[PDB]
Design a protein around this nucleic acid. Structure first.
Lengths: 185, 139, 37, 82
RNA sequence: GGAAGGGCACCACCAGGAGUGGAGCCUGCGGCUUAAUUUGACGGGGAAACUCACCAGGUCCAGACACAAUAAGGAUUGACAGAUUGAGAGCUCUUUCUUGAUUUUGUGGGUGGUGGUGCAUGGCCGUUCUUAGUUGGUGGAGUGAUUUGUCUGCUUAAUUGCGAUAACGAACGAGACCUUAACCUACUAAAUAGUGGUGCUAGCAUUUGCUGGUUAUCCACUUCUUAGAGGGACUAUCGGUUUCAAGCCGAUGGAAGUUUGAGGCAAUAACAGGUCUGUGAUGCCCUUAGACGUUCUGGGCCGCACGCGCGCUACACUGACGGAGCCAGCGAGUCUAACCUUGGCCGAGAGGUCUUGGUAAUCUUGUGAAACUCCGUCGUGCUGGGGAUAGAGCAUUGUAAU
C-alpha cells in the first residue's frame, strides 16, 4: 500500500490540472509493483471524452512529467456521481451524522453546506420523526433554488430516502438535491 | 531531446538516409517522436519550428521507416492539428511509393476518429495512387 | 535571448528566466512578486 | 540515535508556525531532547520594476534540532509533508 | 460669449540651494555623406561575432499532386578519393562503386498557405474613466422641446452633511477594502546572530587590571540582531473658528496628531487601442526560379562645417600632492560548472601562480567603499588646478581588439 504523501501529491496535481473535468476524489489500491490510482468522479464524460480522453491525456502527462516509463504504474477510472450532487451519498452522510450524536440542525447545516460547496443549484433535507420527545416532528432545510413539477423533476433533481434507526424510534431522511442545469451535458 | 532543430534535421537526414527501414523506424519512434511531442507539448501555443518540419520531410525517403516509425504510434499518443498540418505537408511534398502509402491509409482509416487523422487521410487521398483492393475496402 | 515564446522585447535578462515585460506581467501571479507597496 | 537538524522555510507565517508547533508537540509527547525553533531573519527579496515601483517577497525560515532513531525521524519527515 | 471668483502645484511664482545652456569630452535625436551609416519616437536600443533587422559579394533548396514520354543490358540517387577553389564554402566530371523509378524534362487545376493582407466570430498582457457627482424610477406642470429633482442660505478637501423647499425612493460613485512604515529592558526564543560571566592560553604593568586568541569549555539572556503575538492612534485632551452641526485651525500629552504617509482593488461609462504564428469550398496578386527560407565571408549600425539635449571632468589654497587613521548598508555568488574568492609567493603595476572557504545571517564579509579626520609638500603663478589630445611598450577577456 502506497503512502498518503503520494496520494496527496496526486490530489495537488489533479486539483490544479482537473479543474474543469470533475475531480471528486481518489480511490487507490496497490498490488505488487502496481499502484492503481482510480480517479473518483463530478461528471465523467469530461474524463472519458470523445473516443478515448483525459485518462490517456493524464497518463501520458504523468509519463512525460513524472519520468515514468509505460509499464511501472497504471492509471484507471471509474464512473460514479459527484458526492455532493448525489442525494444517495449525502443521505448516507446524513444518516451517519444522525447516528453519531449530531443533532438535526448542525448536521443539516453541514450537509447542505457541503452540497452548496460542491456546486449544486440547490438542495433540501426533510427530517421527520421523534427526537427525545413523545410527539413527532418534521423539519425542512432548503437552500439554493429547486423545482417541484414536470419533466425537469425527472431530469434534474435526485431524491433519496433513508430510514435511520435510533434508540427511541425511527427517523425518515429525505434528501433532495438540484443539480446545475447548465452542467447537464 | 536537448538538441537544436537544425541538429535534429541533420541527424534525421543522417539516420534515415543511412539506417534501414526498421532502424530508422526505431530512430524516428524514439528520438524524433519524443523530441517532436516535447517541442509541441511543452510549448504554450502548441506549434512547431520549421526545421523539425524539414526533419519529418527528410524522414520519408524510406517510407517503411517513416510510416512504421513516425505516424503510427503518434496518433495513438494524441495527435493535434499543428502536427496534422505540418506532417500532412510532409506527407504531401515527398513522393512516396504506393505500397506504404496504402498501408498508411489502411492504418489511418482504422483509427479512433480525429480531424488530424482526417487531414492525413485527406493528404493520402490527394495522391490517387494505384491502391491495392484491401486499401480500397478500408475506405 | 528569449527562449520561451520568442519575445525579446523587454527581457527580465536577469537570472536567465528571460520573459518579456509584457509576458512577465502575464506570469507575475505564478512566481510571487506581487503588489504590496 | 541520530541527531538531525531540520531547516524549514516558508512564505506564509501561519502554516510554518503550525508545522514547527507540530514538530514541538510530537517530539515533546514522547520524550525527545531537542533545541527550540530557532527563527532566522525573514529575508526580503525585492525587484525594482519599471517613476518606478517595487515588488516584494518575505521569506521566513526556522530550524529545529532533533535527536531520534531512524523510525521516528522517517515517520516525522513523512507525515509533516505539507 | 474673450465676465469675474476660488483652488493649489516647486513638471507655477516668491525665500533661497544645486544647477544646465559657458570650456573639453561621453551619450540620444536631427542634418550631411555613403555602398550601408538598418529602423522607431529611451525603444532593456549597452556595446568587433551573434543579437542585426543594413551594404559588397559568393552560394544552397525550391514545385506538391495529376499527367505525355523515358526502365533494372540502366533513369537515377547516395559512400567516396583525386582534378578542384575563388577570399571561403559549394559546383562539374574520372574511377572504387551503392545504383533501383526517390526516376529526369516540360506542363495542367494548386499542394505551400512555415506568401499573406481584408470579412466576420470569440476573446486577451500595458491597461484606464486608476468613474471624487451624476444617473435613471416615476411624479406633476408644459403641443413638441422643457421645469423640478439638479436649491435662497450655510458648510466640508467633495453633490460630505445641515437647512429651506414639487416633492418621494435606489444605484454605482466618493469616502471606504488590501498592503506597508515607526515605539515596545512587558511576552516567545535562539552555535547560519550577538552580549556578558566563566574555563585553557598570549603580551603588557603589576595593587586589583587592559588587550585578546579559544564554530562547543559551559551557563544565562535577547540589552543590542531576529520570527511573531498583540498593543498603540481613535485627531487623546485643551482653546480659537464653524448654522457655534457634520468639520477646520493653534497648543499640550503622545513612538506616531497634515487623512502618521504612500501606493494596488472594484461598478458604470471610452479605447479599431496591440495580436491569435485561430478558425471558416472566406475576397484576392501571384501560385516558386522569388529568396520569404538558408548560409558563408568582409564592411556597417560609431563616419563628420553644423543644429536640439542630458551627463562626466575642471577653471583650484573651505584646494591639489605625500603619507597616516580606516566608517557603513542594500545586494550577489558556482552542477553536472569555472561563480564569488580568503590566504601564500612572483611582478613597478596590469596581472600571474598555488590553493583554500562558501549553493550561503556561516566563506567572500566586519565587503577596513568614497567623501571624511590629522600631519607634512605646494604658494596663487592656465600653478604643483585641469586632463583633453597624442607617442611608446606591457598584460587581461574574447575565435577575431584594426
Amino acid at each position: 500500500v502506497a503512502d498518503g504523501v503520494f496520494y496527496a501529491e496526486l490530489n495537488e496535481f489533479f486539483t490544479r490540472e482537473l479543474a474543469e473535468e470533475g475531480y471528486s476524489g481518489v480511490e487507490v489500491r496497490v498490488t505488487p509493483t502496481k499502484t492503481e490510482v482510480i480517479i473518483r468522479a463530478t461528471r465523467t464524460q469530461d474524463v472519458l471524452g470523445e473516443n478515448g480522453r483525459r485518462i490517456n491525456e493524464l497518463t501520458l502527462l504523468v509519463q512525460k512529467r513524472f519520468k515514468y516509463a509505460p509499464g511501472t504504474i497504471v492509471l484507471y477510472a471509474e464512473r460514479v456521481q459527484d458526492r455532493g450532487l448525489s442525494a444517495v451519498a449525502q443521505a448516507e452522510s446524513m444518516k451517519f451524522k444522525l447516528l453519531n450524536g449530531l443533532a438535526i440542525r448542525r448536521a443539516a447545516y453541514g450537509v447542505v453546506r457541503y452540497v452548496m460547496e460542491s456546486g449544486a443549484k440547490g438542495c433540501e433535507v426533510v427530517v421527520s420523526g421523534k427526537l427525545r420527545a413523545a410527539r413527532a416532528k418534521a423539519m425542512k432545510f432548503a437552500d439554493g433554488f429547486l423545482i417541484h413539477s414536470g419533466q425537469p423533476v425527472n431530469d434534474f433533481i435526485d431524491t433519496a430516502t433513508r430510514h435511520v434507526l435510533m434508540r427511541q424510534g425511527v427517523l425518515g431522511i429525505k434528501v433532495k438535491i438540484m443539480r446545475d442545469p447548465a452542467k447537464s451535458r | 531531446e536537448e538538441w537544436s532543430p537544425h541538429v535534429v534535421y541533420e541527424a534525421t537526414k543522417l539516420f534515415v538516409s543511412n539506417l534501414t527501414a526498421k532502424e530508422s523506424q526505431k530512430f524516428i519512434n524514439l528520438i524524433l517522436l519524443e523530441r517532436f511531442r516535447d517541442n509541441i507539448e511543452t510549448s504554450e501555443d502548441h506549434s512547431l519550428n520549421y526545421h523539425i518540419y524539414r526533419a519529418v520531410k527528410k524522414s520519408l525517403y524510406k517510407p517503411s521507416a517513416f510510416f512504421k516509425g513516425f505516424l503510427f504510434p503518434l496518433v495513438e499518443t494524441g495527435c493535434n492539428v499543428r502536427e496534422a498540418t505540418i506532417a500532412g505537408s510532409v506527407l504531401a511534398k515527398v513522393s512516396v511509393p504506393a505500397l506504404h502509402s496504402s498501408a498508411a491509409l489502411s492504418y489511418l482509416l482504422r483509427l479512433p476518429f480525429s480531424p488530424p487523422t482526417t487531414v492525413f487521410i485527406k493528404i493520402l487521398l490527394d495522391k490517387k495512387y494505384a491502391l491495392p483492393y484491401q486499401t480500397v475496402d478500408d475506405c | 535571448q528569449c527562449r520561451v515564446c520568442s519575445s525579446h522585447t523587454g527581457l527580465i535578462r536577469k537570472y536567465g528566466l528571460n520573459i518579456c515585460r509584457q509576458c512577465f506581467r502575464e506570469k507575475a501571479n505564478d512566481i510571487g512578486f506581487n503588489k504590496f507597496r | 540515535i541520530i541527531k538531525i537538524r531540520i531547516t524549514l522555510t516558508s512564505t506564509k507565517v501561519k502554516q510554518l508556525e503550525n508545522v514547527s508547533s507540530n514538530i514541538v508537540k510530537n517530539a515533546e509527547q514522547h520524550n525527545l531532547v531537542k533545541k527550540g525553533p530557532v527563527r532566522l531573519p525573514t529575508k526580503v527579496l525585492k525587484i525594482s520594476t519599471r517613476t518606478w515601483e517595487t515588488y516584494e517577497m518575505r521569506i521566513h525560515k526556522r530550524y529545529i534540532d532533533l535527536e531520534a532513531p531512524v523510525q521516528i525521524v522517517k515517520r516525522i519527515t513523512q507525515i509533516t509533508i505539507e
